[PDB]
Structure 1
Amino acid sequence: NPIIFIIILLTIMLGTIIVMISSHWLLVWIGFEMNMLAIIPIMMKNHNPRATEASTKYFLTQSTASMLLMMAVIINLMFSGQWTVMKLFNPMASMLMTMALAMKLGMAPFHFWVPEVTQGIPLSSGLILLTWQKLAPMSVLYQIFPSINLNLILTLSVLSILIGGWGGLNQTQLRKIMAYSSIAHMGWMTAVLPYNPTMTLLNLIIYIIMTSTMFTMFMANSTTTTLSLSHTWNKTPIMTVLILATLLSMGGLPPLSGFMPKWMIIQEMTKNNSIILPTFMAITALLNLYFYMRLTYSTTLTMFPSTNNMKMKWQFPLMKKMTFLPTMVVLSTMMLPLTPMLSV
């Protein structure tokens, strides 16, 4: 595909800009549906039966998500009648606002599409456009941080790490593990929103970079654990060392800068007399680490995936941000712990 693929990709970039730079309620409504028209062609790409099934499952869940969001916009005319994105002014519209944004994100009750959508994506270039897409509903949630009830956000954040922590244990597909770490990390996202809206934006920065480092290192084609197994000996051994720095960082480990969200999310919550919730956060986070525990053994060990066919010609992929971003993803906890102020 020539220029038209870049134009479609630029309209997702432009689509989230309408969401970011906004004041009107129908303006963000357009911004969400600008993405809906633009992700689907990249979802298809290679003319697959899996791609047709994934896109239809992606659309029918996210089209209903937007129409539930528009109901919250119309109730904002029923009561008050002000079309400025600041507060919902309703105990009813706030319910239909948070649950609609939960549909677009990987939050607890509306998570079922996430693993099956990720499987149907043809290439690693399309796999980024779900992790980057989650910036759009998060940007609205930052704007309407008050007037939203704790009983139907924090319950959806706690359950998502529970179902995320058990949702990747019986899975071997590399796309499916990344799809359930998405559900796992979204619980750490929305838990901060009541206890200071700050650090939610920084949690995005850590997550989006760390997820993009994975798929750019998955440019050497691998879909399963057994296909990423034949990489230690048949392919380059230095590549297994750099993926190890990204696998272990996604779980809660302090020498790596993937502990930098788990630094402040617990810290800000403990300030507001809540200890029983951050305990439940950190223990369930070990189940998220446990996926990468068995996935590190694919790279650290021999595991016998030799294969008679040996590659002599050197691999030439895109690798656009595959060098600059993992250096920041591995070490930033010693570099910038004062970056909380710089981001938000």
Structure 2
Amino acid sequence: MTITPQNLIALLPLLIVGLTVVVVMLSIAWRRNHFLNATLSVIGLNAALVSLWFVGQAGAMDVTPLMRVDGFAMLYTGLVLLASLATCTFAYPWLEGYNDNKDEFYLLVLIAALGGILLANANHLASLFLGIELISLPLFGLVGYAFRQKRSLEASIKYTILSAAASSFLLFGMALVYAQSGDLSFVALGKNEPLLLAGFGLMIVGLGFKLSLVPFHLWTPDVYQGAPAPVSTFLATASKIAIFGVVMRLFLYAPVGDSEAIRVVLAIIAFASIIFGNLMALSQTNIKRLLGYSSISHLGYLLVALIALQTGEMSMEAVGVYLAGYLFSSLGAFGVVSLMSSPYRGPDADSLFSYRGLFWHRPILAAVMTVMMLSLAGIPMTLGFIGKFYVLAVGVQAHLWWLVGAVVVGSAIGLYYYLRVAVSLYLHAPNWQYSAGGIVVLISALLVLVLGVWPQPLISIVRLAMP
């Protein structure tokens, strides 16, 4: 079909952000200024949030055969935009101390927002590929931003080779499915012969690298230690939040995901992700590796809901609310880590042994890390508990007894390291945009508390979005 004004209003998120890249690139070539580039980039992402209202004026419809725009995609675009908003506000205080070329940062984050808001809208297997790679190239390059350290370059190179490897597995799987089926459109796929299933397993490999699943999780510690903390805010939250939407939509639409042959394999990956995350996560004394270890377990809880997407309609809202709660928890925690590095400081010295005290140093910021760190676990009065509660309900609904038991025993194992960091901020002690960065994490603390005690308004938004 051609371009109609309905299609342009539907495409408005992918458009405002793209116009922002052009204006930011022209502004970089004009002046090369940090203040103007930060202002121009954050205005475009805020303009994308405003235009989410305008696409809500439009209904559930297609733009091209590549994309389908539903109300589900409206919420996922919003999650990615607040993470992009969150990462630029955490990057200005870290980059003020950087020695030179301080302006390429917002350009790459803007490209990654294009990639994230393109995996929200998906209907064809090719859009899946244009999105994964649009976000990886900034994540190829931003973990290597400030390569002057001996580990940022190390982290960039390890992530670079491995992410190209996953994309090559995804592309080879993407074709081996299309050999049987006449089209690669998600809906048109599956219209249980082994080549289609074999092609499907290859896409699971190429998707489970970025979702940090059990035999592909090896990158998640190292780059999270190596990357800058502003990059870790985006790498923990936005990428996997955007990626989880497209992998859920493929199994919802495709009739091959209805068959139990793929279901058993994904359940075992989810089982082992919880276990192989929450057991190796105990011994760590580094906060960045600690959050990277928890990421593997959080994506595992998302999978134990996704396996029962096909049994009961409550799994849609369950995945949605756990993603919202998981966004807020990780942004607050990673913002405090980045807010401790108020200058560039070369290599930031962050560790669990380095976080003795921190209440008599900065009391407000210690409270935010504690609230979010209790929210990661499953303690009530926090939004993580309501998200944990729906995934338990989904597993009970679909009679996945081993999987729901894994979440409980994984929660039982994983309570230990969250609580040490919560109490280690209470042992004996050994600029304007910085106040803005404090405001972002403090705003998130208020939100996770009020949506843990009072969780109904977030459910109303989620059922408003779900089709």
TM-score w.r.t. the length of structure 2 is 0.67
Counterpart in 2 of 1:158? Answer: 271
Aligned pairs, how many?
Answer: 332
1:225 aligns with 2:352: yes
Alignment deviations for residues 284-303 of structure 1 (CA, whole Å, 9 cap, x no partner): 1122221111112212333x
Pair 1:31-2:114 in alignment: no
The answer as to 2:296 corresponding to 1:172 is no
From the superposition, tell whether residues 327 and 293 of structure 1 become closer, same or farther in structure 2 (CA, over 3 Å). same
Aligned-residue offset at 1:25: 1.7
Q: Please tell me the root mean square deviation across aligned C-alpha atoms, in Å.
A: 2.0
Give the drift of 1:216. 1.4
CA contact (8 A) 1:145 1:194 kept: no
Mapped contact 2:305–2:395 kept (Cα < 8 A): yes
The answer as to 2:467 corresponding to 1:341 is no
What per-residue deviation string (whole Å, max 9, x for no partner) do you get for residues 37-59 of structure 1? 21233212222220111111101
The 3-state SS of whatever aligns with 1:34 is helix
Q: Which range moves more in the overlay, 54-63 or 25-34?
A: 25-34
Given the alignment, which residue of 342, 365, 377 partners 1:239? Answer: 365
One-letter amino acid matched to 2:250? I
Does 1:136 pair with 2:242?
yes
Partner Cα separation in structure 2 for residue 32 and residue 126 of structure 1: 17
Q: Is the 8 A contact 1:43 1:55 kept in 2?
A: yes
Stretch deviating more after TM superposition (167-176 or 24-33) = 24-33
* Structure 2 gap segments, 5+ residues each: 1-100, 191-195, 310-314, 342-348
- CA distances 1:216-256 after superposition (whole Å, capped 9, x unpaired): 122113510122214222x1223323322111111011222
| 1:16 corresponds to which of 88, 97, 116 | 116
> Equivalent residue for 2:320?
201
Asked if the contact 2:322/2:387 (under 8 Å) is kept, the reply is yes
- The structural deviation recorded for 1:316 is 5.0
Question: Distance between the aligned counterparts of 1:341 and 1:98, measured in 2?
Answer: 28
After TM superposition, the structure 1 stretch with the greater mean CA deviation from structure 2, 80-89 or 138-147, is: 80-89
Instruction: Name the counterpart of 1:310.
Output: none
1:6 aligned partner: 106
Tell me if the contact between 2:151 and 2:226 (Cα under 8 Å) persists in the aligned partners. Answer: yes
What is the CA distance between 1:317 and its match in structure 2?
6.8
1:324 counterpart residue number: 443
Alpha-carbon distance, 1:343 to partner: 4.7
Q: Cα distance 1:186–1:88, how it changes in 2: closer, same or farther (>3 A)?
A: farther
Equivalent positions of 1:1-344 (< 5 A) are 1=101, 3-46=103-146, 47-86=148-187, 88-89=189-190, 90-121=196-227, 123-131=228-236, 132-146=238-252, 147-148=256-257, 149-196=262-309, 197-198=315-316, 199-218=318-337, 219-221=339-341, 223-233=350-360, 235-302=361-428, 304-305=429-430, 318-319=437-438, 321-337=440-456, 338-339=459-460, 340-344=462-466
Task: After superposition, give the CA deviation of every residue in 1:146-180 in whole Å (9 maximum; x if it has no partner).
Answer: 52312211111111111111122111011010000
SS in 2 for 1:48: coil
More helix by share: 2
Match for 1:51: what amino acid?
S
Structure 1 distance, partners of 2:439, 2:128, is 30
What is the DSSP-based 3-state SS (H/G/I as helix, E as strand, rest coil) of the residue aligned with 1:104? Answer: coil
C-alpha distance in structure 2 between counterparts of 1:343 and 1:226, whole Å: 43
Correspondence for 1:311: none
Give the residue type in structure 2 aligned to 1:220.
M
**For residues 26-84 of structure 1, what are the alpha-carbon distances to aligned partners after superposition, in whole Å with 9 as ceiling and x for unaligned?**
22212111122212332122222201111111011111111111122212321112121
> TM-score, normalised on structure 1?
0.90
Structure 1 position 98, deviation (Å): 1.7
Q: Distance in 2 between matches of 1:7 and 1:194?
A: 37
Q: Equivalent residue of 1:182, what SS?
A: helix
Distance 2:397 2:440 in 1: 37
**Cα separation, partners in 2 of 1:238 and 1:318, compared to 1, 3 Å:** closer
- Structure 1 window deviating more from structure 2 (16-25 vs 165-174): it is 16-25
Contact 1:251 1:288 in 2 (8 A): yes
1:238 match: secondary structure: helix
What is the CA–CA distance in structure 1 between the aligned matches of 2:377 and 2:185, rounded to whole Å?
39
Q: Once structures 1 and 2 are overlaid, which stretch shifts more, 33-42 or 185-194?
A: 33-42
Question: Aligned partners of 1:271, 1:335: CA distance in 2, in Å?
Answer: 24
SS at match of 1:44: coil
Question: CA contact under 8 A between 1:87 and 1:144: conserved in structure 2?
Answer: no
Q: 1:87 to 1:297 in 2, by over 3 A?
A: farther
Task: Tell me, in whole angstroms, the C-alpha distance in 1 between the residues paired with 2:154 and 2:249.
Answer: 34
- Quote the offset at 1:184 in angstroms: 0.9
Unpaired segments of 5 or more residues in structure 1?
A: 306-314
CA distance in 1 between partners of 2:118 and 2:151 (Å): 31
Equivalent residues of 1:188, 1:265 under 8 A apart: yes
